[PDB]
Amino acid sequence: MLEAKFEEASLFKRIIDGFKDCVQLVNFQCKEDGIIAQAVDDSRVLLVSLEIGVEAFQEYRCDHPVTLGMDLTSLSKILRCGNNTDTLTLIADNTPDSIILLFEDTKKDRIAEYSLKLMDIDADFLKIEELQYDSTLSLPSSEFSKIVRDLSQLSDSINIMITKETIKFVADGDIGSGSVIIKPFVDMEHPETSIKLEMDQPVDLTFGAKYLLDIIKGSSLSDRVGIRLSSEAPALFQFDLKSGFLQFFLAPKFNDE
Amino acid sequence: WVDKYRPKSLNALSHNEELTNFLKSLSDQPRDLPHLLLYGPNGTGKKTRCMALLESIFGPGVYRLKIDVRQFVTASNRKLELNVVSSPYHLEITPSDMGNNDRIVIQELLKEVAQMEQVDFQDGLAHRYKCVIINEANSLTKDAQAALRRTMEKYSKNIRLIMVCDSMSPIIAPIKSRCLLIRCPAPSDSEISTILSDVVTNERIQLETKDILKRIAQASNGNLRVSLLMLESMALNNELALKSSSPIIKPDWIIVIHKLTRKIVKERSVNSLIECRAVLYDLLAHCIPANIILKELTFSLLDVETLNTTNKSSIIEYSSVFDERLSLGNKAIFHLEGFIAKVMCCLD
Amino acid sequence: VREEDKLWTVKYAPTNLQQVCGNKGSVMKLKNWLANWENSKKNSFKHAGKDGSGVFRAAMLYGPPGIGKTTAAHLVAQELGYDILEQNASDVRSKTLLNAGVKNALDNMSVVGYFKHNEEAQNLNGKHFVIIMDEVDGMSGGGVGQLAQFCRKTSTPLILICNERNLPKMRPFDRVCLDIQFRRPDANSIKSRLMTIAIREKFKLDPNVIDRLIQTTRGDIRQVINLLSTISTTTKTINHENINEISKAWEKNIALKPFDIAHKMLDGQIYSDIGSRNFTLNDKIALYFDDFDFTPLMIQENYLSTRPSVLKPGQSHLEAVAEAANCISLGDIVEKKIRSSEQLWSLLPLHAVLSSVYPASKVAGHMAGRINFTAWLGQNSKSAKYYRLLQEIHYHTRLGTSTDKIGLRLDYLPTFRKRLLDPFLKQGADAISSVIEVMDDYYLTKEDWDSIMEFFVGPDVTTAIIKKIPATVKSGFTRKYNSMTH
Amino acid sequence: KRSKENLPWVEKYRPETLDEVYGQNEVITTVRKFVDEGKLPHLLFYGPPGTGKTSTIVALAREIYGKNYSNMVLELNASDDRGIDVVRNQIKDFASTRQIFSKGFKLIILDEADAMTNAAQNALRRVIERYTKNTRFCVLANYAHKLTPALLSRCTRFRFQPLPQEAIERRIANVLVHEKLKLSPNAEKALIELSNGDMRRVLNVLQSCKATLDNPDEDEISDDVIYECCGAPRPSDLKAVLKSILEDDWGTAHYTLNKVRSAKGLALIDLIEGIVKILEDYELQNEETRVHLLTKLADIEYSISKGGNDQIQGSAVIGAIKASFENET
Amino acid sequence: LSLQLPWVEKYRPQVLSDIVGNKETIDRLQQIAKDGNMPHMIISGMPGIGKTTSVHCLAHELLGRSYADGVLELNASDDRGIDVVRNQIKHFAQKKLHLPPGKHKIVILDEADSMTAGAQQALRRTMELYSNSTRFAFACNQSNKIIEPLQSRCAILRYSKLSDEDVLKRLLQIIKLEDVKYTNDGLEAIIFTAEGDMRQAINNLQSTVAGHGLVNADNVFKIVDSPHPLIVKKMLLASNLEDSIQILRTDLWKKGYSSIDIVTTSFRVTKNLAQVKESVRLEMIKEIGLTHMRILEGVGTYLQLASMLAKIHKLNNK
Ligand SMILES: Nc1ncnc2c1ncn2[C@@H]1O[C@H](COP(=O)(O)OP(=O)(O)OP(O)(O)=S)[C@@H](O)[C@H]1O
Ligand SMILES: Nc1ncnc2c1ncn2[C@@H]1O[C@H](COP(=O)(O)OP(=O)(O)OP(O)(O)=S)[C@@H](O)[C@H]1O
Ligand SMILES: Nc1ncnc2c1ncn2[C@@H]1O[C@H](COP(=O)(O)OP(=O)(O)OP(O)(O)=S)[C@@H](O)[C@H]1O
Ligand SMILES: Nc1ncnc2c1ncn2[C@@H]1O[C@H](COP(=O)(O)OP(=O)(O)O)[C@@H](O)[C@H]1O
Ligand SMILES: [Mg+2]
Ligand SMILES: [Mg+2]
Ligand SMILES: [Mg+2]
């Protein structure tokens, strides 16, 4: 069995909306600790990894670890046909079968019981985030979104360069170029606007613009995006939730030069 | 007249009594009537017998028809429109209208009418199956034929398929097998003459003797509708007075084909082939089926007496070859010109 | 700025009309037209000139590529002190953007010309526009319709430049604007220019090879200039000792049009024993591959309208035509199988051989008349237009006829002619009462009566018998029909 | 519930490594030496259906990276869309970035690339060579004419010859080891001759004759069981029918044909092929005999491919054989 | 885990002198590069002769260190519609760049035969107007697929197939640089199976070298699979039907070749059979096409090819 009753309804909707049009097929693993998930992109370039503990759930009951594979399109179709004022409950039987999403209003009796037939995704559970990163930083989501969607209009590649107390986003295209250089500084009146940086070696590496534009869609969840960069390692873009976290593992674009 | 004097039941069919008895046998237990396929010569009276059996099994109110318009859409934006002849007990389709989109029309409309049921008051919904009539089934496309054959057994307690067609050969073996095959022989001269006698005593036309009706029956080659129509045209032109000396009114295209055969047998040259191509263009451009043109041309060529045995034999061989080639192509003139060139090379 | 970096085609471009080699008459006519455009505008363009040129507001330039069309159109506007407005294929041209950008510049004045020169009285037309529409052929993005509509509501000299005139898309330009034809120049016009270039570049050119240079590149002088420039970097002596390699390596592979492809594939010179190795079968198939949309239709149109020269001993013309038509039918079968389902496109060269190459080779000779245009494209459209009317009539009469759309045309219409038309001939205007009681039976109208008569062929031709009955019964029948209610 | 024994024999015995790929020794050896030396150019496997191409490339992908091959290796079979808009975005982005797990060259397997449009191959023609020092392409195909000459030239051509008798025999022995079963030598020869190189038909008819034993632990699969499972005509009555057609008259030949084709429910399409294979060995002392013998039989086979009749075609085969065996006298 | 570059890429010439193709055109390009006044040019020829590498070495030698910002190459992978050719190509054409005196900006439009006609139409004037700063260079495989004006503005430069001498010279260079044991027979066999294709020749060389070490006739004829069209050309010219049938059975059918490929190759070979006459060629092509139509409906057994060969022999013998 598996019973997960959320506190609200739009929580799961906003959670799925982070990687709605980024990945197609996911596989949630439910255990006594909470719901974990990791899914590879269609082009096998970035990986979405979500961890939500038992803190966001109003009620949680899971006896044995269960795996539930499903596509995101039908899942979003099911979440869209539910009113944002109900209470959501995920239900799974003994053996992994069609997952039951149940919407129950708090005032009038409205039982909306939808079924979702599982896909048979190969359980290649991956173990990353144990690699020591060379550089770590954290900065407000609004600034990152602004910078990236301003630099995306000039090219399709973006070079991130972390040097001695300097962060540099460089876009180089056909019509022109652009360079945004920021420095670490912390404010006492507004602790959320501070940009933090802890480096060990200067790191310069490139990424694509489409993947960054798809990643920054997750800025609606949190306000302080963390970025972990390392040579010969996937870049980690982390959004911190109130119970877990949503992390994108992006692959850097190598340079022919 | 053609449309006026037509039987509207099984006790009124006045020719081919064996087929009428067989239809009455098939009209005894309606709830066990399988799918039907009528085959025979053109203008034999297949649709009238179909609608008569349909009236015998249902109520007499099946003859009141109404035309409706249905709009379908293909994979692309090209919207197609079809006409459906519906009645409170059946519906008639002519799927041959759409060029190569018959597979959509069949698999859509037949499925739509098969899933749901019929409700009408004339004890609110309980009724028997619904009948679908398909005119010119021989022109159905192979994929459309496969769809129609598959939508037969899945939903059998709701749809009964009664198809009619002449020259049953372009019907795939599965459809030929999973349905009953009923042949409609053309009426004999002694019966079409009686039909003409009833028409002339009912319409009050002035005829001298019975030889005129015999000549009309002999000229029509057995076709009842064409014989009735030619009789009416002769009565119209002869000013309400049929005499023993009246020129048989051949349709205009028959006269064109006869002049074409004369031009062929007289002058065997490429210069005549150019005028032949012009005549074939003028004939095809005015909505004439190419297979009918080929059949009439070949039979009129064999009618020519100045040709010996070997010429007619090679002519019929080339006609069979180009008729095989005609059912596997789209540009019909491309085959008709070749057949004319071959018969010209054969004659000399 | 630099003088050597130039592409040998801009440093030597004609800077005056007396340097455009070839077609003196055409450029002279165009110059006179642009000069008398103002005088013809004074007469509202309703007075034809000596050559009948003042009745046209817009000019059209067409001819083979690389002859000086754009050069002439620029120099003729620069010489008369006008201002040049030039739009080309790189600019986005569509009815919306055309009515947006250049429609305002159709009847306005120049803003830059007012500051150019106004102190001295050079000419009164130094403040007006001459809009040069170059490369009208390329309209992949209101390309020809709106531009043709510009030819009537214009107020400034409108010069249009294209490459091929008889293309079907640009037909509206037929009689709405004056057109002139620029021909491929001979070897006598460009010879002086080429010798003067050879003098000014320190490299030898024999006056005997220039004709071969013009022959290998049919009518593109720019191609000759580029050929000379490319070879003058390592070899400065171009004479009869190496002209063969140049003429063989720098041939022009132009695309052939439906007329030329038929004229070439129907010539009895290629299929001879000598021509078979000078123009191989691979080239013959490539000739089809240039245009696989009109070549089979052209061949089927004019395969028996020629006098062959490859007739085998014993075989006459009729037998060759019969074999050609048999192969035409086989190619038609192959084409239907190609354009059917499963999208079998790997079967194209078989169609190329069956439809085009074999019937051509069978009746290959010397063509008697001219290359006739294909007739099946119009006949199929007419057949479709007639089938629509037949379907309409059949679905109108379906309530009473109880017959397919085929059995009605072959049988019913002969008697319907006797019933409907004949009373109007033998009885006159008093049979109007009877005829109507027929059509209301079959739910027909005046539109169906207009269409039914057009179907008969052979001895019964109604399009001439209709003009025989009086016009008063024609005017009374429609009134009687419109008055009464169904 | 789900286990390895539920899979059909077509997939249950899929070669895991390269060592379990028999027959194509001269290609497996070269591929192993490629991966051992460290260099692996763009490969293009070309072979008849059911030879070992996909199995070989999957075993290679497993050997190169690890037991998790479908992690850093991209695979575009005929089930995914492979238009120009796909080779533009997906393949290029996969070939322009690094791996996520380890540090090595990336592998892209375009399986059945013969089903790609010409524009897609023309677009791939440059991206296949622009990024060479990071990714490698493997093009699997069955029809070597669908590929454009350019893409065909950029890849090293490896042909997968049909499985010889020894390879199929070794595989049959290995299958009979794991599954308790016994198979007759003449049955083995008949199965080899019926295989026609297809390794899948072998396992299919083997599972069939194993199921048709009623006790697949003691009784041996004789030739009759194999001939019955696929309904193929035994050489005995085939040669009997051929002899009766060649020697006897019309009535008795038609009678014996209708008696043989109705004793086991044979098909004329298989009888034609069997008679052709048996009669190709004869020494006809003229060239005009074989011409008609092949032309008429091919026409009859093409007509059978449309299913016109069933007895008219049999008498047509009889007449074609008899009329072809007449110029000899 | 380091993967060595292939012999086709590791030894790709980076200098215009290392090109072993057509001597005259390569010398012309060399003189143009030393001078600098490079005009628009179309390079077309058989697949795998060195057109792209030639134009790339030309650009690298003409611009040197400015190659990063002076050349804009658009391949078939990148978009080449009307939008891009109108916006990006134009913006790069007017891009003000300070180059050495006798140099120019270059645009490498590879695979020109794949572009739409409208793209070339829009490109005509964009190329003609800014000739003082932009010099386009097209490199395709079929010059007929390019529209006439674009082809006429530029100076055409045809490319012929590589003769056996050039291929053997480059092969000897590669062997000398790679220290491989070889024999003359192996190199002759490689050249014979290369059908005049530098890339295919080098790939087959690397394959046989890594597979057996010694480049001998046995190894190459073992793992190179001598070209298809030659066997089919040998099959269609047999004297008696039995020899051609035996060739089809042993060399084509038994070696695992699909019937559709054999039919297509036979058609393509008969298309260029200069020995026999024209009428016999047309009749053979018609029969091969009938067999092709029979194959495409699904029935593709050996009997169909046998009957096709029988019909070709009946046609050629009488
Ligand atoms: N009669 C001529 N005399 C001298 N130079 C000429 C002549 N015709 C063309 N040219 C040269 O050709 C170039 C001008 O090209 P044009 O012929 O004007 O192109 P076009 O006529 O517009 O044909 P398109 O637009 O390419 S189809 C310049 O280098 C001119 O010097
Ligand atoms: N060389 C071989 N050795 C052993 N088993 C083989 C061999 N080739 C094929 N098989 C068997 O056939 C099955 C399918 O082979 P595949 O390699 O997938 O066929 P294929 O090469 O992909 O040809 P296609 O894709 O159908 S055209 C394998 O799982 C094996 O059971
Ligand atoms: N003349 C040559 N001399 C030396 N190497 C050559 C020569 N021609 C081709 N190559 C080799 O072929 C490869 C580059 O060829 P490409 O330029 O890609 O051929 P191509 O002319 O572009 O024809 P495509 O584009 O494949 S249809 C490199 O590995 C070169 O070493
Ligand atoms: N038993 C009959 N008695 C009188 N007329 C008949 C009879 N059977 C057929 N007809 C005539 O046949 C005509 C209809 O022919 P129809 O059924 O449309 O031919 P088809 O079967 O080819 O569609 C009617 O006008 C009708 O007069
Ligand atoms: Mg121009
Ligand atoms: Mg495979
Ligand atoms: Mg290239």
Tab-separated table of N, CA and C in Angstrom, chain A residues 95-124:
chain	number	residue	atom	x	y	z
A	95	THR	N	0.796	-4.355	-5.112
A	95	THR	CA	1.666	-4.411	-6.274
A	95	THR	C	1.555	-3.120	-7.079
A	96	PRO	N	2.643	-2.684	-7.715
A	96	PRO	CA	2.599	-1.412	-8.449
A	96	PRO	C	1.700	-1.481	-9.672
A	97	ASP	N	0.547	-0.830	-9.589
A	97	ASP	CA	-0.419	-0.750	-10.675
A	97	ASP	C	-0.799	0.714	-10.895
A	98	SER	N	-1.842	0.927	-11.696
A	98	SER	CA	-2.373	2.258	-11.969
A	98	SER	C	-2.514	3.070	-10.688
A	99	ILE	N	-1.792	4.189	-10.626
A	99	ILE	CA	-1.811	5.026	-9.432
A	99	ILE	C	-3.124	5.796	-9.380
A	100	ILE	N	-3.658	5.976	-8.175
A	100	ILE	CA	-4.956	6.606	-7.975
A	100	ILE	C	-4.727	7.997	-7.401
A	101	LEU	N	-5.053	9.022	-8.182
A	101	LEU	CA	-5.054	10.391	-7.692
A	101	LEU	C	-6.465	10.760	-7.258
A	102	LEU	N	-6.606	11.158	-5.997
A	102	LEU	CA	-7.925	11.415	-5.438
A	102	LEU	C	-8.001	12.846	-4.939
A	103	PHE	N	-8.956	13.598	-5.478
A	103	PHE	CA	-9.237	14.965	-5.061
A	103	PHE	C	-10.495	14.954	-4.203
A	104	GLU	N	-10.391	15.505	-2.996
A	104	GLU	CA	-11.509	15.568	-2.062
A	104	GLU	C	-11.616	16.980	-1.508
A	105	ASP	N	-12.726	17.653	-1.803
A	105	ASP	CA	-12.946	18.993	-1.281
A	105	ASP	C	-13.099	18.959	0.238
A	106	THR	N	-12.909	20.124	0.856
A	106	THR	CA	-12.963	20.240	2.307
A	106	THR	C	-14.328	20.672	2.827
A	107	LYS	N	-15.201	21.185	1.967
A	107	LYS	CA	-16.528	21.628	2.381
A	107	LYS	C	-17.648	20.756	1.841
A	108	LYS	N	-17.715	20.566	0.527
A	108	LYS	CA	-18.728	19.730	-0.100
A	108	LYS	C	-18.096	18.424	-0.562
A	109	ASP	N	-18.870	17.345	-0.494
A	109	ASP	CA	-18.376	16.021	-0.857
A	109	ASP	C	-18.210	15.922	-2.370
A	110	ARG	N	-16.969	16.066	-2.838
A	110	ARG	CA	-16.629	15.884	-4.247
A	110	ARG	C	-15.445	14.934	-4.327
A	111	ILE	N	-15.713	13.683	-4.678
A	111	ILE	CA	-14.691	12.648	-4.783
A	111	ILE	C	-14.316	12.517	-6.253
A	112	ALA	N	-13.135	13.009	-6.619
A	112	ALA	CA	-12.621	12.898	-7.983
A	112	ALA	C	-11.496	11.870	-7.968
A	113	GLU	N	-11.789	10.659	-8.429
A	113	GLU	CA	-10.842	9.547	-8.402
A	113	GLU	C	-10.386	9.270	-9.829
A	114	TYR	N	-9.160	9.673	-10.145
A	114	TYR	CA	-8.573	9.430	-11.453
A	114	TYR	C	-7.517	8.339	-11.350
A	115	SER	N	-7.433	7.513	-12.384
A	115	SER	CA	-6.421	6.474	-12.468
A	115	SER	C	-5.381	6.841	-13.517
A	116	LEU	N	-4.153	6.387	-13.285
A	116	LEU	CA	-3.073	6.636	-14.236
A	116	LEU	C	-2.302	5.336	-14.414
A	117	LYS	N	-2.363	4.771	-15.617
A	117	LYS	CA	-1.684	3.512	-15.892
A	117	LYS	C	-0.178	3.725	-15.953
A	118	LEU	N	0.559	2.895	-15.223
A	118	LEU	CA	1.999	3.056	-15.119
A	118	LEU	C	2.702	2.611	-16.394
A	119	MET	N	3.830	3.254	-16.673
A	119	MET	CA	4.744	2.769	-17.686
A	119	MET	C	5.777	1.851	-17.042
A	120	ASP	N	6.359	0.979	-17.859
A	120	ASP	CA	7.394	0.050	-17.415
A	120	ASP	C	8.752	0.649	-17.769
A	121	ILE	N	9.216	1.557	-16.919
A	121	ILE	CA	10.525	2.172	-17.095
A	121	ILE	C	11.572	1.320	-16.395
A	122	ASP	N	12.675	1.057	-17.093
A	122	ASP	CA	13.788	0.308	-16.520
A	122	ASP	C	14.311	1.045	-15.293
A	123	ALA	N	14.437	0.331	-14.176
A	123	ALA	CA	14.849	0.947	-12.922
A	123	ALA	C	16.360	1.128	-12.850
A	124	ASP	N	16.905	2.031	-13.667
A	124	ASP	CA	18.331	2.356	-13.606
A	124	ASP	C	18.533	3.550	-12.671
